[PDB]
Design a binder for this molecule. Sequence first.
Ligand code: CLA
Ligand code: CLA
Ligand code: CLA
Ligand code: CLA
Ligand code: BCR
Ligand code: HTG
Ligand code: HTG
Ligand code: HTG
Ligand code: SF4
Ligand code: SF4
Lengths: 40, 162, 141, 63, 29, 80, 90, 153, 67
Amino acid sequence: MRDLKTYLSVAPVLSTLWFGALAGLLIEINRFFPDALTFP
Amino acid sequence: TYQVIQPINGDPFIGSLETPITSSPLIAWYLSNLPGYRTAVDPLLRGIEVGLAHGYLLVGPFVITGPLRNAPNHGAVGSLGAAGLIVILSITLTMYGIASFKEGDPSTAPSLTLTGRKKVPDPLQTADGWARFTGGFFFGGISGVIWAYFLLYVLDLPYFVK
Amino acid sequence: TPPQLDPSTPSPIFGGSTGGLLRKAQEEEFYVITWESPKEQVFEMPTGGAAIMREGPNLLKLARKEQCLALGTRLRSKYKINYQFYRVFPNGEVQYLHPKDGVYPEKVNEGRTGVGVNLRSIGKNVNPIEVKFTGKQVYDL
Amino acid sequence: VGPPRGSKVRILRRESYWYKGVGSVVTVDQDPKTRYPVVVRFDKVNYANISTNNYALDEVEQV
Amino acid sequence: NLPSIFVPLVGLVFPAIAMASLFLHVQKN
Amino acid sequence: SHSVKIYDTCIGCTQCVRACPTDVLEMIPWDGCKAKQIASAPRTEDCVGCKRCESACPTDFLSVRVYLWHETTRSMGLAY
Amino acid sequence: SVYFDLEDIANTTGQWDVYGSDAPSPYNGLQSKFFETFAAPFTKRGLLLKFLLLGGGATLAFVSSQATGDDLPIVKGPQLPPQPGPRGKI
Amino acid sequence: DISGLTPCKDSKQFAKREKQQIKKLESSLKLYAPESAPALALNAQIEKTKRRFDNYGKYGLLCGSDGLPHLIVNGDQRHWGEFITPGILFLYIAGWIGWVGRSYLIAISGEKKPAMKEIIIDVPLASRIIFRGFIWPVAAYREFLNGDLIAKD
Amino acid sequence: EVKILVDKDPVKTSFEEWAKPGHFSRTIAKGPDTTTWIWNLHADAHDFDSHTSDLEEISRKVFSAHF
Ligand code: CLA
Ligand code: CLA
Ligand code: CLA
Ligand code: CLA
Ligand SMILES: CC1=C(/C=C/C(C)=C/C=C/C(C)=C\C=C\C=C(C)\C=C\C=C(C)\C=C\C2=C(C)CCCC2(C)C)C(C)(C)CCC1
Ligand SMILES: CCCCCCCS[C@@H]1O[C@H](CO)[C@@H](O)[C@H](O)[C@H]1O
Ligand SMILES: CCCCCCCS[C@@H]1O[C@H](CO)[C@@H](O)[C@H](O)[C@H]1O
Ligand SMILES: CCCCCCCS[C@@H]1O[C@H](CO)[C@@H](O)[C@H](O)[C@H]1O
Ligand code: SF4
Ligand code: SF4
């Protein structure tokens, strides 16, 4: 349990989780606010 | 059992091996009877033979594959090209001889046979010997080119490919 | 130590290879490594392949000093055999090389004098302009 | 002779990997014939993965 | 007139003479 | 022949000598280090310049330095 | 049993003449006399190099200068009216 | 307008581009039943294009002689929404990231083997640090005055 | 004779070695000092004969990797 939490804190796993969350956020923003060239 | 491949001359620490390609009696005799390995005879005659063979062999490609191959003058043009190649080869031989051999130095050829018997080293590896060899080569090559031309386009013998 | 001379000892059993001596040994130099073995055994050759070292004295001729030293270190590490090697010239002159003092060079020994020792740190070498138009290098000073 | 053992020292050798850095003195040789007596240990490894080096008495500054 | 003579000289004969001389120079001693 | 030089930052652990592929270096008595020995290069005519000694050098900076110099048949590692 | 002798370095290092033959001349005497007589001028290496280079250069220049339009298209020259340029240039 | 450009609500090339895009989309509509799902998907694309062009008209962008929007960066007060405001937002996010990274690197520096917290991240410590970037300009300024920002070597 | 030959419970199933990167080799298991370590971990991941000198131990590893 402790060892598995230590493994999930390793660089590649944390990196893929973080970038997946970022990609999902950006994708949803672009889905609901598409084609933004300026900032109104 | 019975192995065929042996170390060269019985010495396992010389960088070669004895194989049927290199040490069979037929190939050994054939190589020993070529003009390039006739140690005890004037290099001029050996060069004559070598040039006679090579200039004769050089005529065909120039005559048949050349730019003017389809012209009625193809034979003479190809023979002239072969003669020019022989001249260039003689120039290269003279250059190598001048660069490699000094007039006073003795021969660089080995003085032992395969059986360890002392022999006279080849005079071809001297300045005078090489000069005689290249002169003979030039004279033989020009004559061979002329002979091939005479056989092909002066007597017009029914050769299949001309 | 008084260096040992070169007898006519036998050579390891080998079938021959294309990696042996060339004409450089005829005109420039070659090298000879001699050792003593307690038994006949297999050893890899530095020129390729495997040879049989005989019990008693063993003599082997090679093209380079590096080949002789590589074979020697392999003998010392694997078979625990002491070795020597010499440089032989076309005129029959033999020059003893290693072990030079009778002691291997990694072990300190009296009677040796330093060659190429600089009594300064590597950072105290002078700049090139100080040796410009002279034939000397900065590390030779 | 030398900085006290366990102190923090700045390196003044120009060619050293830890030039102008800080290390810890482990031992100092007391033999007067020793050219570089001060043994220093560093936190970072050099390009040869080595963390210890010997320095002379004038290449080390007590900080 | 001139090109038919000069082109073989500059393109073939002069390079050959220069190469022979330079080779004999670099093979000296 | 290449140039091999030894500086007094030597600690005398004999690492260079046993890394030499052509037996160029050796160890000689000294008094400037605790080991009471320093390296020397009396046979630089057999040097090939592979710089294996510098890879075994623990001192910072290197105590053995190899400078590539005029090339001979021995220094280029030619067996032909 | 041994292949290392200090008195015979040539045998030790393999300085052998493998295919060299010491047999006498296999050529006929009259033919050898003829070739010796008529190839003697070409046995001077200093003379041969100069003669070959200079005579070959002169022969090459002469042959190039005697070539006709049938042998070389460059000697024949153009036979067709010239093409015009992209935008009327000549 | 600026640099000889005309607003995209006036330029005829912009409207011509919008008409041609819709015509290109409507040619593939002919190959499907009027009630099919691909017909419903191309219609959504047509509405998306109409909305895009209408938005580009409304925001007040300048278009060249090609019918395409052109950005104005020099600093004009009526074109701040193309470079200035997005740039400020980017500079706020990037400074946030940099400051959170710097604080985490400082927090693990004084340990036995601090290279293990750089490959295995102390997630609770990162959670503590992360939300300090919301006020990163204030702290970054304040360590500039005191002198805790720059190492004086 | 040809027969099935197995060993029971040779390696314990635990998450403890997941939390120790580079456990498979002596040098890498000590942790990183430079960035080279990060690459060395991935280049030697499947070099089983460099991890151990036991032929049986290597063979079991390749057998499971195939699965
Ligand atoms: C076009 C190239 C060519 C050709 C056709 C010949 C032809 C000939 N040469 Mg010659 N030669 C050449 C180049 C050539 N040479 C060059 C470049 C040199 C300078 C080193 C010489 C130097 C030379 C000397 C010094 C002598 C000859 C001699 C001879 C004749 C005897 C041939 C012989 O015994 O071969 C023997 C060939 C070898 C020992 C070479 C080894 C052959 C290997 C094992 C395999 C052959 C490869 C194979 C044929 C390739 C085909 C495969 C391909 C289609 C993929 C023969 C007319 C002799 C002569 O004049 O006799 C009257 C003679 O004494 N040559
Ligand atoms: C400026 C440089 C130059 C020049 C002027 C030439 C000129 C020529 N080349 Mg050539 N060539 C060159 C560079 C050059 N080459 C290079 C760099 C390459 C390598 C890519 C080639 C490869 C090449 C090929 C592969 C061929 C030519 C051929 C030819 C000839 C074509 C004309 C023809 O159809 O008559 C044909 C006329 C003959 C065959 C009779 C020529 C008889 C000559 C004039 C006798 C005189 C030779 C002389 C004694 C030797 C002097 C050597 C010198 C060192 C002193 C012509 C003489 C063709 C040819 O047939 O030439 C052999 C041919 O097949 N060339
Ligand atoms: C703590 C993170 C951090 C910070 C504060 C900086 C800060 C800086 N870097 Mg830098 N860098 C970083 C990480 C960081 N870097 C990483 C990870 C790399 C390897 C890819 C580099 C590679 C790099 C180069 C090659 C250069 C800089 C340069 C610079 C300086 C100019 C700004 C710049 O060019 O940014 C550009 C930054 C990058 C290209 C890398 C950004 C990588 C991400 C965004 C950082 C992520 C950090 C970490 C994963 C998050 C921490 C999480 C934690 C809370 C658990 C500036 C001092 C330049 C310089 O020295 O000029 C003055 C320069 O040439 N950096
Ligand atoms: C079934 C086939 C097979 C097997 C079991 C092995 C097994 C092995 N090989 Mg091997 N190899 C193979 C095929 C195979 N190889 C082939 C086909 C080649 C020729 C290309 C090689 C070339 C090769 C070399 C040159 C070396 C090995 C080595 C090794 C050993 C270490 C492997 C390791 O740790 O890699 C760890 C794995 C990685 C570091 C991952 C690399 C990722 C690659 C480069 C990316 C591939 C691109 C990808 C398809 C596209 C993705 C796009 C991206 C944007 C996501 C191991 C015993 C090494 C060794 O020391 O052996 C003892 C060694 O030096 N092999
Ligand atoms: C107005 C304008 C403009 C201009 C601009 C400019 C000109 C700018 C400049 C700028 C500059 C000239 C700058 C400088 C700077 C310097 C320095 C020196 C800096 C530094 C920085 C730093 C130091 C940072 C740090 C940090 C932080 C704080 C955060 C993150 C992390 C870190 C730590 C990195 C333009 C036209 C474009 C457009 C319009 C607007
Ligand atoms: C969302 C914030 C809290 C997330 C906590 C995830 C596990 S926290 C995790 O704990 C391990 C020990 O079990 C440590 O070794 C490791 O450094 C640490 O990141
Ligand atoms: C340093 C950049 C050049 C500084 C230019 C000063 C503002 S210039 C200013 O710009 C306004 C729009 O922003 C216009 O409405 C106004 O007519 C004009 O005078
Ligand atoms: C080096 C050339 C200039 C580089 C300018 C990089 C930012 S370019 C900038 O990026 C923003 C991101 O959303 C866009 O909204 C905006 O339209 C665009 O002008
Ligand atoms: S160069 Fe190669 S051989 Fe010469 S000393 Fe340094 S390491 Fe030994
Ligand atoms: S390696 Fe460094 S320390 Fe070891 S001997 Fe050579 S110089 Fe002296």
